[PDB]
Design a protein around this nucleic acid. Structure first.
Lengths: 221, 221
DNA sequence: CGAAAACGGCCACCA
DNA sequence: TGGCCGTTTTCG
């Protein structure tokens, strides 16, 4: 179980993400999906006794929001070497849906030589909206997304890593494929509300957390 | 009669599913169809005196929602070996309608060597909607579904096992073929309402049940 | 004959 | 209602 670094969120998840499965967090923009991704990108490298996976991180960005400085902040919060964190995070920006899936081909071969624990795909659904904008082409983007999700599940079962994808809510296919769906909504200021909206094992429940300069971290009224 | 593991639902069914016949549960998404399937996948292995069938389980998944951990939770609830439960559940994900029917060919030969009591097909109608999306191809998916249902009835009469298929309600052919139709709807929180909408023997009636971490289990206000 | 435009008709979404 | 395409006519 990879620690989220929010204790309340860890309790909500019973200790953190299950490696080897896809966890989807759907919420409005600015809810902190990207911030949680940046935090996990570092916490994954933490020792297992500290809630990490003792593995490198993979950040596939489609939205430009990748900040190595956020990774440095998370590393210094938990006392990890920021330089080693950036050395254990491989980053690449996907320009389109086809490029987004093509990067998985390099990811599968690269993930064999080194132990990874986390795969991050940020604005995973944005490129299927910007690229495929027509109505007759909807089935094509749905097929590409389906294949992409199957590839995610395959890599998860192959390397035993956690698969994190982010969705902006301004597909029903992900429900059966994703094991845990988390709904994120803004509480005013920088403090966010998290809700579980389906889990066969986890209750439907809510937990409050905040977005702090160092971290994605528990709410401290 | 295979125990549902909800006492109120067992009373609704007069003790549980009749083996050798198809029981259809149609309801909205998140009503708990999959949860009931996971529970039954373990309860089938229970002794007959405990409401089981003393047989192995078969889970054909089309939606990715298969969770061995849910099976482990159901096994520990009723005190069954979780490892033996997973050893008595054969699992396979159908990628399309043709693959969904093709898996029945392996199922028929495999079900001869060992005693099974339950066959689960989850999102059974989803692949006929994702694969066959056009309007001119509707008769083709209806024919494939008809043949699939006939194969289900044949296997039910051959092995005396319970046939469970799940349908998302966002065909009229199943009515004559399915013996008991159950309508599932959400009560808020995790507690679900079950209604019988046709049975020649069972009354039209309703029963309240809940979805608990261990189990599909009676409502406990 | 044919550019071009002016109309007409047809479709998309979901209401 | 907006867009696109078939057409029709109109003017050179």
């Amino acid at each position: 179980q990879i620690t989220t670094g929010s204790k309340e969120l860890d309790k909500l998840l019973q200790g953190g993400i299950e490696t080897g499965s896809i966890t989807e967090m759907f919420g409005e923009f600015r809810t902190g999906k990207t911030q949680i991704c940046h935090t996990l990108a570092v916490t994954c490298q933490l020792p297992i006794d500290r809630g990490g996976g003792e593995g490198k991180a993979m950040y596939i960005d489609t939205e430009g929001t990748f900040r190595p400085e956020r990774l440095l902040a998370v590393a210094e919060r938990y006392g990890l070497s920021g330089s080693d964190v950036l050395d254990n995070v491989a980053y690449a920006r996907a320009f389109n849906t086809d490029h987004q899936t093509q990067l998985l081909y390099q990811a599968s071969a690269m993930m064999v030589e080194s132990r990874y624990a986390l795969l991050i795909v940020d604005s995973a659904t944005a490129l299927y909206r910007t690229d495929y904008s027509g109505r007759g082409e909807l089935s094509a983007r749905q097929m590409h997304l389906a294949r992409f999700l199957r590839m995610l599940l395959r890599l998860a079962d192959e390397f035993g890593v956690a698969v994190v994808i982010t969705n902006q809510v301004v597909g029903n296919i992900i429900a059966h494929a994703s094991t845990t769906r988390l709904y994120l909504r803004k509480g005013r200021g920088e403090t966010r509300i998290c809700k579980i909206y389906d889990s066969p094992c986890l209750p439907e429940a809510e937990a409050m957390f905040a977005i702090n300069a160092d971290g994605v971290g528990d709410a401290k009224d």
